[PDB]
Amino acid sequence: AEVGRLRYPPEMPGAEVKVYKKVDNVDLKLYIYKPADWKPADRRSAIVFFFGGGWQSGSPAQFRPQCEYFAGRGMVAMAADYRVGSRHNVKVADCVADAKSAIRWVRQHAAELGVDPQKIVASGGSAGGHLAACTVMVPDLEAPEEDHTISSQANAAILFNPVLILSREGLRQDWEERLRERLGTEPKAVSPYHHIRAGLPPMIIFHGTADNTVPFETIRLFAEAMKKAGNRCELVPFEGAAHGFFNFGRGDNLAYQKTLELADEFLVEIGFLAPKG
Numbered sequence: 548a549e550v551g552r553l554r555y556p557p558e559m560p561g562a563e564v565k566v567y568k569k570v571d572n573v574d575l576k577l578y579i580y581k582p583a584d585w586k587p588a589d590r591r592s593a594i595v596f597f598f599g600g601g602w603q604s605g606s607p608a609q610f611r612p613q614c615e616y617f618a619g620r621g622m623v624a625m626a627a628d629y630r631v632g633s634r635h636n637v638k639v640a641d642c643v644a645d646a647k648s649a650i651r652w653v654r655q656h657a658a659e660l661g662v663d664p665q666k667i668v669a670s671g672g673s674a675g676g677h678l679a680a681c682t683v684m685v686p687d688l689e690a691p692e693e694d695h696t697i698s699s700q701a702n703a704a705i706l707f708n709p710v711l712i713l714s715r716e717g718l719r720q721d722w723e724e725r726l727r728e729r730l731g732t733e734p735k736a737v738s739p740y741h742h743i744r745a746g747l748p749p750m751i752i753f754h755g756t757a758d759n760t761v762p763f764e765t766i767r768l769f770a771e772a773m774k775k776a777g778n779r780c781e782l783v784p785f786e787g788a789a790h791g792f793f794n795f796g797r798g799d800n801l802a803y804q805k806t807l808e809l810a811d812e813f814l815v816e817i818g819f820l821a822p823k824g
């Protein structure tokens with residue numbers, strides 16, 4: 548409910564604003580939080596958050612608290628706007644292009660951001676978690692006006708109850724034709740589950756076991772298949788928790804603090820953050 552009441556466009560107090568993409572006459576912005584000791588020639592890890600909202604609505608404000616946390620830990624932390632259905636009359640494949648554009652932009656501009664271009668983390672909640680997952684493992688579906696010599700692939704992912712299975716193949720023609728028109732492409736082309744293979748970037752996933760929007764079982768299957776392929780895919784179930792459980796301002800912030808603690812340790816584990824101390 549509280550995520551639902553967030554402002555668009557957000558204020559994002561303390562963020563620097565950068566336009567990463569111009570498309571359909573809209574400027575898509577990154578809201579960039581730097582650590583207090585940031586200096587130009589730093590080579591920090593970065594994290595880019597994608598808000599949730601069913602590819603229909605939402606706001607970068609959702610992930611403001613997370614950005615401030617990760618900035619305080621030494622990362623360049625940012626929340627990306629991306630086109631959605633209610634504002635821009637786009638479909639999911641467009642959202643995926645925008646997410647990929649954001650990662651590509653951060654990598655392209657890593658030097659001036661004070662960022663290591665091979666320590667860029669994608670993150671998001673629900674539909675934004677799907678987008679993050681697409682930046683790590685789904686091939687680019689389009690070549691927008693951007694630097695095609697720079698990869699769009701994130702180096703790690705941190706997902707908060709993501710959608711990861713968008714096709715029914717390998718689990719009814721009309722439903723896949725239905726999905727094709729909703730998604731703007733063949734459903735498998737924006738289905739992370741359908742692109743599981745060896746040699747993918749590491750990730751951590753936080754998911755409630757009582758999630759009635761994205762069933763936990765889809766995430767368990769994803770994670771099990773990822774481990775079978777030799778990938779580091781850490782799945783943290785939150786027993787009895789519902790969709791959106793991880794958000795700032797939810798359930799006395801307990802699950803908010805817990806997800807951040809475990810996300811932080813994962814980033815230490817993969818060498819993206821120094822140990823606390």
Ligand SMILES: [Cl-]
Pocket residue numbers: 757758759760789790
């Ligand atoms: Cl739920």
